[PDB]
Amino acid sequence: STGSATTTPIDSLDDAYITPVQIGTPAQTLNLDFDTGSSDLWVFSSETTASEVDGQTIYTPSKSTTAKLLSGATWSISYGDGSSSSGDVYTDTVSVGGLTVTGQAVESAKKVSSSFTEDSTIDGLLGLAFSTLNTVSPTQQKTFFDNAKASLDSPVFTADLGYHAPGTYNFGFIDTTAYTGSITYTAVSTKQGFWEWTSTGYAVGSGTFKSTSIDGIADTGTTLLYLPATVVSAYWAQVSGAKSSSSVGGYVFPCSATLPSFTFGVGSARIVIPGDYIDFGPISTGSSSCFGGIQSSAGIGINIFGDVALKAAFVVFNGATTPTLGFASK
């Protein structure tokens, strides 16, 4: 089997991407944030505290003839941005882009933190990291990809995120028309439950490539590119007037600037992030200070190849017995 679904930016900055997902019988379609940095499929639901729902579409398990309470199971998750959610668990039929899994754990939110409530466009998350990170207790549950894997033509999914445009998530096949050149594959460590890999270095603009190992995670659920402070300082030093602002929470730059590109290494290959992809716009409406898309990972404890980096590439998440990551230009 295979599946193919379009993923759409939630706003003009590509702050996140939503993908329609069919849950239950008859289908209830919710727009979920596919997140390769976590491993829970959770949804706003008829059980969510009413004051914490503000425009999201909800899953109502009582209206699904295939929903079954997973008796005794609870879940609770906290994300790197400080957001959180928790609740109970149903199993139900879940389909993405024509690919169907029966008996998928659908984690129904009883509580969500304010940032989820305040984002009316995201109806939940669909985790695509390794199932060892799934938070369901006392019986840990498998991700949608883990459940589908054995049925897929090939045990892979791909992320093809757009810059200020829709893109595609495919399951079970590699669309050879979706990228240019060849795909360069690189080793993955699953020890932390992430799609963790080691970049071979970086360049700023037209500058020379610096060969240096950068361990980080491929995370579609993180907006920006978070790298070591040395790398990030080298980038922003090429932008007149750019500075790190403790009050704003990272590097800002004059909105009048033209940003240089940023290149990252994948083995001997190179992925170029155009300068425009690094512009996240005014810090507040009407400001001439703009927020940077490359930020320091210092204090986060891990480097994160988020959407800013991933949208510059066609990315293969290879879930073979020994997982690997592939990157191609596009």
CATH number for position 295? 2.40.70.10
**Which among 110, 144, 174 is the end of a domain?**
174
- Same domain (yes/no): 157, 268: no
> Do 198 and 137 share a structural domain?
no
Judge if 229 and 163 occupy the same domain.
no
Just list the catalytic residues. 35, 199
Q: Which DSSP state fits 299?
A: T
**Last residue of some domain: 124, 159, 174?**
174
∠ CA 207-213-214, rounded to 5° = 90
Statement to judge: residues 180 and 163 lie in one domain: no
Phi, psi dihedral angles at 115 (to 5 degrees): -65, -35
Which has the closest alpha carbon to 311: 329, 292, 286, 298?
Answer: 329
Clarify whether residues 138 and 179 are in a common domain: no
- In this structure, are 43 and 179 located in the same domain? no
Closest to 318 measured CA to CA, from 143, 128, 131, 79: 128
Q: How was this structure determined?
A: X-ray
What CA dihedral angle connects 166, 118, 226 and 107, to 10 degrees? -80
Do 157 and 87 share a structural domain? yes
Question: Which residues form the domain of 314?
Answer: 175-330
- How close are the terminal C-alpha atoms of the chain, in Å? 25
Q: 250 and 280, same structural domain? A: yes
**CA-angle at 232, arms to 308 and 287, nearest 5°:** 70
End-of-domain residue from the set 156, 174, 192: 174
**Co-location of 91 and 73 in the same domain:** yes
Cis-peptide into 282, omega within 30 deg = no
Structural domains of the chain, count: 2
Amino acid identity, residue 109? Answer: A
Residues 167 and 182 in one domain: no
Q: What is the distance between the alpha carbons of residues 262 and 264, in angstroms, rounded to a whole number?
A: 7
- Pair 66, 143 in one domain: yes
Give the resolution to one decimal, in Å: 1.1
